[PDB]
Structure formats: structure tokens, C-alpha cells
A paper describes a structure:
Microtubules are formed de novo in a process termed nucleation, which is spatially and temporally highly controlled by γ-tubulin complexes, composed of γ-tubulin1 and associated γ-tubulin-complex proteins (GCP). In most eukaryotes, microtubules are templated from a preassembled γ-tubulin ring complex (γ-TuRC) that determines the position and direction of microtubule growth. Here, we used cryo-EM to identify and characterize γ-TuRC assembly intermediates after recombinant expression of the complex, which allowed us to delineate a comprehensive stepwise assembly pathway from a stable 6-spoked core to the mature 14-spoked γ-TuRC, identifying successive stabilization and conformational locking of γ-TuSC units as central principles in the assembly process.
Stable incorporation of the γ-TuSC(13,14) unit, which is likely to repeatedly associate and dissociate over the assembly process, is a two-step process. Collectively, the observed intermediate steps can be arranged into a pathway for modular assembly of the γ-TuRC, in which the 6-spoke intermediate is expanded by successive recruitment of γ-TuSC units on the GCP2(7)-facing side while the γ-TuSC(13,14) unit repeatedly associates and dissociates until it is stabilized in the final step of complex assembly.
Numbering used by the authors:
A (entry chain N): 848 to 890
B (entry chain N): 546 to 787
C (entry chain M): 452 to 586, 607 to 663, 674 to 771, 814 to 844, 851 to 872
D (entry chain 1), E (entry chain 2): 3 to 41, 45 to 93, 101 to 177, 180 to 279, 287 to 306, 313 to 447
């Protein structure tokens, strides 16, 4: 259970930093990963 | 351009620099990484380069790399990392393509360094990926034996999708490196070599090719904090195996 | 101008040499230098306009200006409006530009507007101070919206800052009528009966905006387009093309309701009361499905304001200067032909 | 958005087949639907686009007692479509009951085609009034869609049956059909047999195969009304934007049409306008006044003449329309069509709401009321006997068409400021 | 590693023969297996490499009541293979018992082929559900391998029998077969007869030799799914790396497929993606949501469009999948194939776990339960009578497929956080 919560914690910590990186190259990774629309709806 | 491209085979070198180092080939690399596995699990202090060169040769002979020229397989040979008190072979390994003609005027040594850095990244990634598919391996062997004990169902049901949440993340990352890091730069590289009729334009194209690839991975100086998180995705992988 | 023309072809490749060289002298009574100057200048104009109209051609550029700013191909627009209006409905600093940029490529590449590679200069941008710029800040997607365009160097000589910004400012005025008419049709489908004066008000407003649009489509747009399509096929140099383009741009800017000494405040108050009517009626119907006595009073207020802005608009249009064409539509055996008799 | 076509009945499937052959020959495609290289267009509204660019039409085919549907089946245009939707008397109640029992699987065909579409704009149906098998069945499926979807539009192109009066229950059937048309549909485009008979006898000398040439004229009309959709325009490329101006009122939603050449085998904007002002160039036969008129022109037009023309059109007062309020003519331009010989260069199409069609309704009302006074003309067929034992739906339809004709005759008045 | 192919049954040996002819024509080799000089590739997974480069396939051939196996025997591709492994009712229990008595020497054939391999990755079998001779026998050998080797994978490509219902014990046989499939196999790829019937009737006009064209489409699919193996890629060149992402759970391991051209006789990444989003380009027929989708593309692609496309694919929300957790689509690229004409340049293949297939299982469950309520449809054949005197294996299979359908319907829910 702690491992699961840590995994959810580390992935949103990726995306919140990914929001301001680069205009084409790095931003696109955020849109590969979320196609399921509960990412950043747990925020 | 004629005498450099037929007498020293300069075009086949760049094609094989993308193939083996930059992972454009890959029965060869999967067979290398499969056959090199029990050595690299042990620390590299008890390993030397001749023990790599042999198994590399058998990797080359059995796979599709055999019907490629003996020169360019000969110019690629094994290398290691000089030792440190926490040596793993997965920490300590490299390939070296070294210069054997006038191609040093085309390929600088720091260009081989950036080559080896992105090689280090795409090594750590397919490293964790094979650990990941061994996790899925433990899943489809053990779960069909655990029908006969009903009480463990909840925790095994839980661990499966903690694993599947990782296996998807690697099934985005291996596919982000496929569609953006080795066709884009490769298309524009291929264009501005094969249309160009001056050596310096080919040189300046290969340079910015590898350099924008550096920015496109998280191997830049400013994206390093991004990199730092990504290393934390690799901890919970090996933790999960235990 | 003769030597000036040679640079702007030499800047984009091939400095071209003269077909024959003569030595020029002054001699008493003998103006043989004059015809040599005209022959060299004429060759300069010939090879320059022979450079422009094939490489970095102007024709597909004019077609792709008529396509979006003048609105020729708008299948793209009924793709775009329907799939983006709910995101456009949010005020400024609640929308983000990647969202609308992706929706723009959505509507472009779905659509039949796929015919030429100069559809990909198109980007969405805004005007921060919409009409004060002519001599919003709280809304965007309702009163701030534009299309962006990039240029090449031979097309930078004909079209520049001024032409592109007039294109943005005519597109904006055209955007107003596009939005109100689709609001009115969306209200029309809401009833496919008792209180029914709102149906008459809706019909009056929608017939009015169609009178305005087909007035503007067939008085300003296509006439000056075809006269431009005559002037550009008899041009002698690039200053001739420049004169024809500037006259065309002046005519399509002058001929609408973009040029007015007050910018026609009556027109703004009239589209305001139309938007207000659409909003409260859809609000009232959705609060009825889930009084027609107070609603009748509000419809009276809207009808009075609409009739007042209408009579101000006919009086201020009849004083202008072929301008009566919306009025020579509107009053056929006569309604809104005169309501308050003066004297 | 996207528009789904429907076709049923013998005349409806005939005119649908002619419409699809018209758009096959009109655009650059094969009779199996392969794009021609030599041809750009949007055909995404009435045809689903495939990977080899097979523009398979959005045409659901329903048949009952098939004879001509078999001839549609074996055709060189039977490779254009195959959506697998073909599923099997001359009375209104008969076709109503036959549609009633199979409403579920044809509704599955409807929902399958709806899932084929991403978005939707409207349903067109090919139907003929009092066509026998089409009549009653078409009213039933109109009821089914009007129950199911209040979010969409229905456009209907149907003819008025006049065979210059063996079938005597035809006014009853047409009356019940038009009752469902006024109350369950949003916009109706109606035509006459007699006006097309006049234009056909004028342009040509045929009398017996008149149906075939009628099909040609219907195809030209249906292409013309859709040209701003199929050729990319920039206004009223939704159906509802076209329909919105002509209909202020939910019962008077009947639209009459015209088209400038009678024979099609310069013309100026003045000439084609005044030709279009004639009722002999209109394909439907106190003073009557239009509520609103719409015109779309397609040809080689000069843009400066058109403002001259509508100036002088105001000046001569060659139209006489005054409903009560400021609703006038709307003139529009569409592309002159390539990929076909452009002879008879400029051609116009005309769309209005005019009160005179009520008189033609009244003619049918005069017939039906006469038969209703005698009450010997239902012939006691068992279908109408099951469906209504007391035959009170005919009286309800009579009171509805009475309301309709009274709304028409009040709509003529310049006191229609209220009850509009 | 190396993958050993298995084939049995009439439909399985048919599709295996078509697969080997497909890879014969696809790569540069002779029909006796001699390499062509004019041709580089790896064919070491499904073919053993010889000294004159005879790529003899890893195909073990088992036959029972051979008619078409004889036609496979005398062929110009009968010089490609000869591993000397050919060894001789329409019931599940019949094929089960016939495999039971010869399990030893066919296991000797298995172990001989295993010794032919140095390493191993997986076993594929060519099988058809309720195929008669294949049914029961295939479940038995699945039991034999699952008992013998827990170290390997099994991939299975098999069709769902629908002949639009003389054979009434077919739901029982398919039910018992799928019971062994859920519990003794790790990943299943299933297809429909009806969806291939739809695509075949759309792309062509054939009805009677439909099997042959079905074989062609199966061969194209089986080449496509293996292209990253046969043409050297650099990721998921093991089977388990491909399988790992799609299956989180050991009972819901059924994978459905799609392929972008229906007819194969530019396309952009946006076009082929949205085509692949259709169920009419998918060869298998509450809201249902995918768990995870995988796509592999092969063609002339531009690498910068693909990130644009998945941006806009997020933006339009043209897919609707939400299992409960962060498992999304995976897009990949493989080589556009040389040594054949590359027409219809870009083509995609699609692999997902979707819950909707449960409904199709439920349809079969509805049939079987109905027959189980009547209990007159085993026909009292002696084979099922010996193998189970009390017929309680059918009830055990019923409770297992009940658990499976309940796992499916819970897997739709966004509370599948537990029991996953």
C-alpha cells in the first residue's frame, strides 16, 4: 500500500515539473502518458 | 567525396553508428544483452575485456549482424568503466567505436563521448525493461500455480497492476524514443548528408544531429532535475522484484 | 527604380545581366539616351514580375487570403466553430494557446481546405484592445480572435504589416456576425405557441443579420475581388501591382462598416441586445423544462431597443454617399420603411 | 455537420438512385467509388470516406414489395455502396403497421449508421406523398425519429400526387401523411406533378416516360440545394443556417423551389432573377405574398451587376411580398461546377415560403371533405379498421389542417404581428 | 528467443500453410527454401537455418482425418519443410481421447523440436475454436504443455465460430475449449467470422470461397504481428515484452486486433489512427472501455507528425478508455517491407484489451445456458459419456466463465483498484 501511494506520488511529481520545460520537445511526453484522464484529476 | 565514400566506406560507418550504438539494429543488441546478462549481473572487477570480446563474437555470429562487413564489426569492440567500490557490470560496460582511418576528421572524440552518453541512457532503459518483463514473467508462471491457495488472492491482485502501471510507463518511454529521437534527427541527417556536396556541411549536420538529440533526451544540463525524477522511477522497479 | 528592382531579385538568387550594353553620353539635341533608359527599365520590370508570379507566386497567396480572412472556404469554419466554441466560450486567461492551436490544425486537416500548402501558415492569435486600436482585455474567444500568417520575401514586397492587419480587422468584424447567427439558429432548434412574440423577435433579428451578411458578401467582397482580378492582369510593374493592391485594400476597408467617424456605436448596441436576447431566452427555456409575464416585459425592452437601434441605423446609413441595398431589400411593400415620422 | 440520407418507397428509391448517379457523374469518382486521378472537393457529408477513397454513401435502403429495388440491386453502381441494410400494401395503415412490426431492427440500422457518424446535422428522406408502400410507413418512421432525436433536423423532398381525378382513399392517406409532416417535421420542400408536367411538355415532347425526366430534374435540384455543402462555401454550410431564415413558424414550414432554365440542352443576373420570379419557372403550381425568399446562383457572374440588379428589382417592384414585417429576399453565390460541361453558364435556384401553396392544400381539403361527407371512400379495408375503429384520426387531421389553412390565410395579412 | 510454431486441425493447418506461403513470398527465398541472391533479414525465430540457407520452418504438423493435409503434402512448398512429424471425430471428447492415447510420441516430437532449439521464447498454435477434430485435441495438448513447461509462453490465434444458428453440441465444445484457454494459457488473440465476413463483403463481392480470403487476411495479420521479430527492430523483440503491457490479469488475457486498409488493392498518421479507432476496421465485432491499446505502424511515415497526432488524439477524445488507472495507448514503428510492391504505403496494426468481447462470450453463454436448461443437445454421444459420466465438467466450466464475465464487468468499473 505504501509502495502504491509512493508510485502515485512520484508520477504526479514528474508531471507537475513537466508542465514548464520546453515548447515542443519535452512537453509532448506529458501527452503520451495521459490518455486516461485521471492524471491531473487526482490534482 | 567519392574517394572518401568508397575507399574508407564513410557512409556505411554513419549507418552503423546509428545501428549499433544509437539502436537502429537490434536482434544483435537483444542477443548481446541476453547473452551478456550473467556476466554483467556479477561485479566487473572479476571480469576483463577478453571475456566480453568472445561472447560479443558469438552474439555477432548467430544474429543478423553476420551478413555485414567484417571491417565495421571489427572497428566496434568492447570497453569498460574504470573501477569503483560499488561495481556492477550494469554500471560498468561500454562499446567503443574507434577511428581506423581519416574518419577522425569527420568523427571527433567528444562526439564519441556524446555517443557513449546516450548509449549509457539507452542501456539503463532496456536494462530496466528486461527486469520489467521478468516481473511479468514471474506473474504468468506463479499465478497459475496459486489457484490452489485462495487466501493470497488480494495481494497478488494488487502487485499485478503496480507492475502494470510501470509496464505502461516503459511502454510509453520506449515508444517516445522510437518516434522522436531516431527518425526525426535521422531524416534530417539523411537528407543533409546525401544531398550535400561539401564535407563541412555533412560535418555540421552530424554535429547538430547529435546535439539536438542531447537536448531531446534528459541528458542536458538544464533538464537534469527532470532526469533526477526519472531515476526515482527505476528504484521502485528493482524494489518490486524483492 | 530600375536599379532598385535588380537588388530584390539579386537578394533571392541570380543577379541577372543586361541583354545588351551601350555607352551613354549627352549630346546636344539628341535624346537617344531616353529610349535606352526606358528599354533597360522595361526589361527590369519584365524580369522582376517574371520572377514574382511563378516562384513565390502571388495567385495562390491571394486565393489563401480570400480563403480565410475574406472567407472563401468555410467548411473549415463549420468544422472549427462547432468543435471549438465551448472552449472559446471561456473568458481570457482561462484558455491556453496549445489547446486552440491543436483545434486549428484539427479543423484544417479534417476539412476540404487541404488544397494548397499555404494553409499551414495559419495560427490563432488575439487582438488585446479590439476596436480602440482603430483610430478584449476581459474576453477572448468572443471579442478577441484572429488568424496568423507568415510571408516570404517576394510576397513581403506586395503584402506587409498593413495588409495583414487590415485582414485581421475585417476578419474580426466578420466574426461578430458568424457568432450571432449561430446563436440564433441554436435558439431556433430549441422550439422546433402561447408566448410567441419572442419567436417573431428571433426571426426579425436573424433575417436582419442575413440581410447584413449577404449585403456585405456581394457588395464589398466579390466586386473588389474581381476588379482586383482585372487590375492584376494588366499590371506593368510591381509598383502597378502595389497600386492595385492598395486601392483594393482601401476599397474593401472603406466599403464595410469598418470606416465610420464613430465606428457606428448603434451597431454595437444592436448586436449587444441580440446576444442578450439569445442568452435570456435559452436560460428561460431551460428553467422552464426543468413566468412568461415578466419575460414579456424583458422582450418588450429588447424589442424597443432593437427598433431604436434599427431606426438610428437606417437614418445613419441613408446619409452615406450604392448603399441602400440592405434597405432596398428590407422594406418591400414596406415595414421599417418609416416608423417615427419626423415633422 | 454530417447529413444522413434515408430512402424508402418506389419513387423515393428511384430519386435516390438518380441522386447518387448524379453525384457519381458530377464529382470525379468511379462507379465503384474509386477517386479519379484527373480531378478539390468535400464529399464527407453524404458519403463516408474510405482508405482507397471509396465514398460509400450514407444511404439506408428500405424496401417493401421490391421490383425496381431489384434493378437497383444489380447495377454498376452497386459497388459504390453496400452498407448491408436492405430489409423487406398500398395503404397508409398497411405501411404504418408493416413499419411498426420491424421498427426495432430498422432502428438498429439507424443507430448503426449513427455510430458510423462522429457528428450529425440532419436526416433527409426520399419519399413520395401517397405513394402506396411509402405512405404511412414514412409517417411512422418520421414519428420514430421525432420521438428519438430532438437534437437534429429533418429535411424532406416529396411530391404532391395529382393524377387528374380506382384509388379513392388517396386523399385520406395524403391527409394523414401531411398531418404528421406539419407536426413532426421541421422543414418541408414540396413539389407538384403538374408543374413538372408543364415544364417537361414545354422543354420536350415526351408524355409516357415522364417519371425518368422528373428524376433528372429532381437530381439537378438536389445537387443545386447541396452545392454550397459539397463544393466548399463559407456561409450556411450547415443546413440549419439555410433553414433558419425561411421559417419563422412551426406549422408554416413548407418551402417551394424554382430553377432558371426550363430547357438546359449571356444570361445576366437581371434576366435570371426575373425568370425566377415567374411561376412557370417554379416547379410548384386575394393576393398572395411571400414571407421570405432565398436565391442561390451558380455560374459565370460579374460581381458589380448584382447590386445594380437588386436596386432595379426594388425599383420595378416585380415581386409582391409583404407578410407584415421586414423579411426580404436573400441572394447567394456558389461555385460553377467543374468536371462537367458548363453550358447554360449562369443558373439560379430559388427557395421561398409563399402562402399560395395553401390553396393547393385547400384543393385536397375540398376533395377529402367531399369524400368525408359521403363516407364511402375508405372502401372498408381492414388495415384502417384495426388502426382506428372509430376513424377519429381523420377528424383530428381535419382540424389540424383547418388550423394550418387558417394560419396560412392569417399569415397573408399584415396583421400577423401577433400569432406568428 | 526462438519461437516454435504448432499446427493442428483443418482450419489451423490451412492458416499455417497460408502463413508459410506468405513468409515464402515475403522474404527472398525459393519454394524449396534456397536463399535468393537478389535480396538483410533474420529468419531464425520461425525457421531453422541450414548450410545452403534452407530456412526449414519450426512447424510441427499433426493431422486427423486428412483430406486437405494431403493437398498440403503434394505441393511445391513441400521441399521447404520435412521435419518428419506427420502423425495420424468432430467432438471435443473425441479429439481429447485421440490426443490422449498418442500423447507420448507427439511429446517425443515436441522434445525433439525442443532439442532442435538452443533457446526458446514461446509456442504458437494454429487452432480454430469448435473446429471438430481440432477441438478437444487442442485443449489436451494445451494441458500437456502447461503441465510440462511453466518457463515459456503460449500465444494463440483462433477464431470464434459463428455460422448463424445440425451440430448443437458446438457451444458445449467451445465452452470447454475456452475454459482451458482461460486457465491454461497466458495470452489469447481471438477473431470473429462475422467481422471478417463484413470486411470481405465490403472489400469484395465473394460469398462462397470466403475461407480463402480469410486465410489471406490472417496471413497479413500474422506477418504484421511478427514484423518487429522478422525485420530487425530494437524493442519488444521478445514476445513477452509485447504481451506484458496488455495483460495485467491472468483471466482477462484476450486481445483484439485491427488493421487499417479494408481493401489493400497520402494516408497520414492521423488518418490511420482514427481509422484504427473504428470497430469496422477491427476484425472482432453500459459503456465499454479499453484497459490498454497497442499500435504498430509500418510504412512511409514522417516522424514529426506523430507527436502532433497524439496531441490532437488527446484533444478530441476520440477514444473512450478508463479502466481505473494510468494504462494508455502504445504506438510503435516497424520497417516498411521491401521485396514486395509497397502500395497502400502506411499501414497500422492494433492490439488491445477491451471489455466488450465479454458480451460476445455472454452471447455464447446465453446459448449454452439455454441448451443446458433443456439438456437435449449433447445428443448422447459416447465420447462425452466416457469422459464424464456425470457431465459436471460443463458445470465447472460454467462457473469459471461466470467468474470470467464477472471479472470483465468489474474490470469495466473505475473501482477495479482492488481485485485486479
Amino acid at each position: 500500500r505504501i509502495l502504491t501511494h509512493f508510485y502515485q506520488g512520484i508520477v504526479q511529481q514528474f508531471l507537475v515539473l513537466l508542465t514548464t520545460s520546453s515548447d515542443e520537445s519535452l512537453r509532448f511526453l506529458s501527452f503520451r502518458l495521459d490518455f486516461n484522464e485521471h492524471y491531473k484529476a487526482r490534482e | 567525396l567519392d574517394v572518401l565514400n568508397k575507399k574508407y566506406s564513410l557512409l556505411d560507418h554513419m549507418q552503423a553508428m546509428r545501428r549499433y550504438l544509437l539502436l537502429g539494429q537490434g536482434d544483435f543488441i537483444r542477443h548481446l544483452m541476453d547473452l551478456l546478462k550473467p556476466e554483467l549481473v556479477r561485479p566487473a572487477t572479476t571480469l576483463y575485456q577478453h571475456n566480453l570480446t568472445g561472447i560479443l563474437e558469438t552474439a555477432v555470429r548467430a544474429t543478423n549482424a553476420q551478413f555485414d562487413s567484417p571491417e565495421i564489426l571489427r572497428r566496434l569492440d568492447v570497453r569498460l568503466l574504470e573501477v569503483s567500490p560499488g561495481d556492477t557490470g550494469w554500471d560498468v560496460f561500454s562499446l567503443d567505436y574507434h577511428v581506423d582511418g581519416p574518419i577522425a576528421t569527420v568523427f571527433t572524440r567528444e562526439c564519441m563521448s556524446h555517443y557513449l552518453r546516450v548509449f549509457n541512457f539507452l542501456w539503463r532503459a532496456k536494462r530496466m525493461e528486461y527486469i520489467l518483463t521478468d516481473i511479468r514473467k514471474g506473474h504468468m508462471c506463479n499465478a497459475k500455480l496459486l489457484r490452489n491457495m485462495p487466501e493470497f488472492s488480494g495481494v497478488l491482485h494488487q502487485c499485478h497492476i503496480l507492475a502494470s502501471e510501470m509496464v505502461h510507463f516503459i511502454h510509453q518511454m520506449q515508444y517516445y524514443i522510437t518516434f522522436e529521437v531516431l527518425e526525426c534527427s535521422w531524416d534530417e541527417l539523411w537528407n543533409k548528408v546525401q544531398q550535400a556536396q561539401d564535407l563541412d556541411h555533412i560535418i555540421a549536420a552530424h554535429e547538430v544531429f547529435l546535439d539536438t538529440i542531447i537536448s531531446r533526451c534528459l541528458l542536458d544540463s538544464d533538464s537534469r532535475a527532470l532526469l533526477n525524477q526519472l531515476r526515482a522511477v527505476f528504484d521502485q522497479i528493482i524494489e518490486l522484484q524483492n | 527604380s530600375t536599379g532598385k528592382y535588380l537588388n530584390v531579385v539579386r537578394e533571392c538568387g541570380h543577379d541577372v545581366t543586361c541583354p545588351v550594353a551601350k555607352e551613354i553620353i549627352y549630346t546636344l539635341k539628341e535624346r537617344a539616351y531616353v529610349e535606352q533608359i526606358e528599354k533597360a527599365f522595361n526589361y527590369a520590370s519584365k524580369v522582376l514580375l517574371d520572377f514574382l508570379m511563378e516562384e513565390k507566386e502571388l495567385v495562390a497567396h491571394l486565393r489563401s487570403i480570400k480563403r480565410y480572412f475574406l472567407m472563401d472556404q468555410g467548411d473549415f469554419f463549420v468544422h472549427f466553430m462547432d468543435l471549438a466554441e465551448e472552449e472559446l466560450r471561456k473568458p481570457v486567461e482561462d484558455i491556453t494557446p496549445p489547446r486552440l492551436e491543436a483545434l486549428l490544425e484539427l479543423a484544417l486537416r479534417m476539412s476540404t481546405a487541404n488544397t494548397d500548402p499555404f494553409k499551414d501558415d495559419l495560427k490563432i492569435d488575439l487582438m488585446p484592445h479590439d476596436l480602440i486600436t482603430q483610430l478584449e482585455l476581459a474576453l477572448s474567444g468572443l471579442e478577441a480572435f484572429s488568424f496568423d500568417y507568415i510571408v516570404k520575401w517576394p510576397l513581403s514586397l506586395i503584402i506587409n504589416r498593413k495588409a495583414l492587419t487590415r485582414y485581421q480587422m475585417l476578419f474580426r468584424h466578420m466574426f461578430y456576425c458568424k457568432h450571432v447567427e449561430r446563436q440564433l439558429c441554436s435558439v431556433w432548434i430549441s422550439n422546433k405557441q402561447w408566448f410567441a412574440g419572442a419567436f417573431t423577435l428571433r426571426q426579425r433579428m436573424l433575417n436582419f443579420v442575413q440581410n447584413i451578411q449577404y449585403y456585405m458578401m456581394f457588395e464589398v467582397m466579390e466586386p473588389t475581388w474581381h476588379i482586383l482580378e482585372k487590375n492584376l492582369k494588366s499590371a506593368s510593374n510591381i509598383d502597378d501591382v502595389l497600386g492595385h493592391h492598395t486601392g483594393f485594400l482601401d476599397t474593401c476597408l472603406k466599403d464595410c462598416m469598418l470606416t465610420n467617424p464613430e465606428l457606428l456605436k448603434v451597431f454595437s448596441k444592436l448586436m449587444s441586445v441580440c446576444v442578450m436576447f439569445t442568452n435570456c431566452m435559452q436560460k428561460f427555456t431551460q428553467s422552464m423544462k426543468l413566468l412568461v409575464s415578466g419575460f414579456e416585459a424583458t422582450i418588450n425592452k429588447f424589442d424597443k431597443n432593437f427598433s431604436a437601434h434599427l431606426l438610428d441605423l437606417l437614418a445613419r446609413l441613408s446619409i452615406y454617399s450604392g448603399m441602400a441595398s440592405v434597405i432596398s431589400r428590407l422594406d418591400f411593400n414596406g415595414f421599417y420603411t418609416e416608423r417615427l415620422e419626423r415633422l | 455537420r454530417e447529413i444522413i440520407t434515408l430512402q424508402l418507397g418506389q419513387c423515393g428509391n428511384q430519386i435516390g438512385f438518380e441522386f447518387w448517379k448524379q453525384l457519381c457523374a458530377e464529382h470525379g469518382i468511379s462507379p465503384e467509388g474509386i477517386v479519379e486521378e484527373f480531378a478539390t472537393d468535400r464529399k464527407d457529408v453524404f458519403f463516408y470516406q474510405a482508405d482507397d477513397e471509396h465514398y460509400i454513401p450514407r444511404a439506408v435502403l428500405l424496401d417493401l414489395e421490391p421490383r425496381v429495388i431489384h434493378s437497383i440491386l444489380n447495377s454498376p453502381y452497386a459497388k459504390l455502396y453496400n452498407p448491408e441494410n436492405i430489409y423487406l400494401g398500398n395503404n397508409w395503415a398497411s405501411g404504418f403497421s408493416q413499419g411498426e412490426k420491424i421498427h426495432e431492427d430498422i432502428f438498429d440500422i439507424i443507430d448503426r449508421e449513427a455510430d458510423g457518424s462522429d457528428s450529425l446535422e440532419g436526416f433527409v428522406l426520399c419519399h413520395s406523398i401517397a405513394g402506396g408502400t411509402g405512405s404511412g410507413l414514412g409517417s411512422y418512421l418520421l414519428e420514430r425519429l421525432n420521438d428519438r432525436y430532438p437534437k437534429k433536423l429533418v429535411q424532406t423532398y416529396s411530391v404532391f400526387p395529382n393524377q387528374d381525378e380506382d384509388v379513392v382513399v388517396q386523399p385520406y392517406n395524403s391527409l394523414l401523411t401531411l398531418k404528421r409532416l406539419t407536426q413532426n417535421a421541421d422543414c418541408v420542400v414540396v413539389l407538384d406533378n403538374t408543374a413538372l408536367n408543364r415544364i417537361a411538355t414545354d422543354r420536350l415532347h415526351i408524355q409516357n416516360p415522364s417519371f425518368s425526366q422528373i428524376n433528372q430534374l429532381v437530381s439537378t435540384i438536389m445537387s443545386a440545394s447541396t452545392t454550397t455543402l459539397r463544393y466548399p462555401g463559407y456561409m450556411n454550410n450547415d443546413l440549419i443556417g439555410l433553414i433558419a431564415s425561411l421559417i419563422p413558424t412551426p406549422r408554416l414550414h413548407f418551402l417551394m423551389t424554382g430553377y432558371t432554365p426550363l430547357t438546359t440542352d449571356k444570361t445576366t443576373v437581371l434576366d435570371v432573377m426575373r425568370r425566377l420570379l415567374q411561376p412557370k419557372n417554379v416547379m410548384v403550381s386575394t393576393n398572395h405574398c411571400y414571407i421570405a425568399i432565398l436565391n442561390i446562383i451558380q455560374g459565370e457572374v460579374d460581381p458589380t451587376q448584382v447590386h445594380k440588379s437588386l436596386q432595379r428589382i426594388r425599383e420595378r417592384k416585380l415581386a409582391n411580398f409583404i407578410p407584415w414585417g421586414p423579411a426580404s429576399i436573400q441572394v447567394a453565390l456558389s461555385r460553377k461546377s467543374p468536371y462537367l460541361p458548363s453550358a447554360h453558364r449562369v443558373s439560379g435556384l430559388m427557395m421561398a415560403n409563399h402562402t399560395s401553396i395553401s390553396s393547393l392544400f385547400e384543393r385536397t381539403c375540398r376533395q377529402y371533405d367531399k369524400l368525408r361527407k359521403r363516407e364511402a371512400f375508405l372502401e372498408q379495408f381492414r388495415k384502417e379498421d384495426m388502426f382506428k375503429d372509430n376513424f377519429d384520426e381523420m377528424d383530428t387531421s381535419r382540424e389540424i389542417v383547418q388550423q394550418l389553412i387558417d394560419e396560412y390565410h392569417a399569415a397573408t395579412r399584415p396583421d400577423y404581428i401577433s400569432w406568428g
